[PDB]
Amino acid sequence: SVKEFLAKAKEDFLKKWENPAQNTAHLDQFERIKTLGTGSFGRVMLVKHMETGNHYAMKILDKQKVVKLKQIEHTLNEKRILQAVNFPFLVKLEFSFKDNSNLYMVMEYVPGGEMFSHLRRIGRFSEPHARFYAAQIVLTFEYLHSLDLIYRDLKPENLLIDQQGYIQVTDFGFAKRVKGRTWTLCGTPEYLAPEIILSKGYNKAVDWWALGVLIYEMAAGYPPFFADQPIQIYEKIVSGKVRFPSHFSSDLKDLLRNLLQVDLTKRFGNLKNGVNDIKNHKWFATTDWIAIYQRKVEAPFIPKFKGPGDTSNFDDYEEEEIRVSINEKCGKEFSEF
Amino acid sequence: TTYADFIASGRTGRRNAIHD
Ligand SMILES: CCCCCCCC
Numbered sequence: 194s195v196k197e198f199l200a201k202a203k204e205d206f207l208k209k210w211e212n213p214a215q216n217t218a219h220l221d222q223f224e225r226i227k228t229l230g231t232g233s234f235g236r237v238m239l240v241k242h243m244e245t246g247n248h249y250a251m252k253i254l255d256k257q258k259v260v261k262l263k264q265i266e267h268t269l270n271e272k273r274i275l276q277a278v279n280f281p282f283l284v285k286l287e288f289s290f291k292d293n294s295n296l297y298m299v300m301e302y303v304p305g306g307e308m309f310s311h312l313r314r315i316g317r318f319s320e321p322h323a324r325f326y327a328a329q330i331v332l333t334f335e336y337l338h339s340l341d342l343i344y345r346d347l348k349p350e351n352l353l354i355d356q357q358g359y360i361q362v363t364d365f366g367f368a369k370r371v372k373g374r375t376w377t378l379c380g381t382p383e384y385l386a387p388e389i390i391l392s393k394g395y396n397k398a399v400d401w402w403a404l405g406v407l408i409y410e411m412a413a414g415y416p417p418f419f420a421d422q423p424i425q426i427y428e429k430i431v432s433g434k435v436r437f438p439s440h441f442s443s444d445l446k447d448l449l450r451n452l453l454q455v456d457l458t459k460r461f462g463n464l465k466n467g468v469n470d471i472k473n474h475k476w477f478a479t480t481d482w483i484a485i486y487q488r489k490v491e492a493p494f495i496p497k498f499k500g501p502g503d504t505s506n507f508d509d510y511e512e513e514e515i516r517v518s519i520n521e522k523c524g525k526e527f528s529e530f
Numbered sequence: 531t532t533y534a535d536f537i538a539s540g541r542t543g544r545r546n547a548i549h550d
Contacts, residue, residue, distance in 0.1 A: 233547040262549065309544060316533075350544050367547070378550050383541070415536035423548065438532070 199339045202279075206340050209277035210370070215530070218242075218288035218299065220515070223251065226502065228510040230307070233346060233366035234264055236513070239302060239504055248502050249287060250303065250363075253515065254296040256523040264366070265526050267379075271365040272298060272530055274342060281488065282333045284353065284361040291530050293521045303361050305354035305496030306506030308411075312349050317414030320442060321479075322493040326352070327408045328477065328485045329360045334404065335468045338397045341370050347403035348381050349410065354506075358492025371396075382423040383416045387455050390427045401462030401471075405452025412445060413438050417453060431455075444476040 223240040226248075230237045235254040242249060259268050275286040275298065288299040308326070312318065318326070330347070337344055345367035353361045367379045374394035386402035388395045409417045417436075418429040433455055437446045451470070454460040461470045472482060484490050496506055536542060 231544075264549070307544075313542065346547060348545065379547065381545050381547050383545060414533060419536055419539060419541060421540045436532075 195335075199336070202336060203340060205279060206277050210273065213273050213529070214276050214289070216290050218290050218297075220290070220292060220297065220517070223249070223299070225251075225515065227504050228512055229504060229507050230510065232351070232364040234259065234262060234268075236510075238515075239502065240299070241502065242299075248302045248304075249299045250284075250301065252298040252300065252364075256291075256294060256296060256527055259296070260523055260526060267366055267369075268296065269527070269529055270367075270369050272296070274368050274370065275300075275365050278337075278340070278342075280333060280336045281486065282329045282360050282362055284363045289530070291527060293518045294516060296527060296530055300363065301361070303353035303355050303363070304498065304503060304506060305356060305358075307350055308352040308354060308360070309349035310506065310508070311354065311494075311496075312411060312414070318411045318493070320412055320445060323408055323411040324476065324480065325485075325490065325493055326360055326411060327404070328480050328482065330362075330404055330407065331468065331471055331477075332482065332486055333362055334397075334400050334462075337368075338400070338468075341372050342368055343371060343375070343397045344368050344400050344403075345380050346384070347400060347407055348384055349407070350381075354496050356496065356498060357488055358495045359488055382426045383410075383418060385427070385430060387431045388457070390431055396463075398457055398460055398463040401452055401460060402454075404462075404471075405449050408445070408452070409435075409437075409449055412441060417449075442476070444474075448474050448476040 223242055226239040226241060228236055229239050229250055235252055237250050237252050240249050240251045254268060259265060272289055284303060285301045286298055290297050351362060351364045353363050355361055374396055376394050384403045384406045386399040389399060406416060418426050420426045435453055451461040457463055462468060464470055499505055
């Protein structure tokens, strides 16, 4: 039943992957309202589409800045993948286009804010609350990895909460379709698996390590490896030692020991039984995976909604101009966008 | 406490991605 779902999901994906949509709107069709964030690179702006009155979250990248940061291939990855995927816990790409200066990805607006905000304010989530979110990530990675995709930037900053209280994963700036191994140093310090830090070839197991970090951070209120500077975080990550709060359940600690496992032949997600080692673990015994997928499970909380276009679940950011040069920049580099 | 150490740290806000 899972296999049959994923077979169909793959044929759907490959059709779009081999024939990507391009140039499906224009900037002048949107009214810019307010900046919602910054992601891996660029910024995200709340916009309103005039013809429908729908609100969207439009990611904007400056082509010249992308080139300087050596993110050309990663950016083409992001858009090609986003336009091809389809899953309940992935933010949907509605439109993409480019102009002389910038690249634009118009996504669904998810008004509940980043998990990050909610987590820092509350301090920590309960184990049942953490498990509800974690389950959604397990299913999302099951989907993505089946398509030979690695996500590579799991963190609370990238997990938006919808009006049903379910997660949508945003920002695919380091996502890559790769069979076998890859080598790019990318991600966020706290979430990096040891094999990335140590410049080894790595695979989708890095995402399962990152899940460990996330579940820990959600249930503890702080990450398993933290310091004032990245180098000190890396020394902690490669040490082989983790400490759990005394309030963590024995089932939670066992899951985490198997996710935050430096040894790849023992890391959950990466053994012969795949994602089933995680889905069948005792910590998830109360989890009804299909009801999670169907959004039939009652969420831990529902974000406050003040109206269409409300951004009060998001921090305020300095507003910057969307400048469009009269000369085309970087045309060849971004021709497929 | 570990929580106090975290809250006093410089990495309790939104964290940026790295690259080389
Ligand atoms: C019968 C529907 C199963 C859904 C499982 C989703 C796997 C990623």
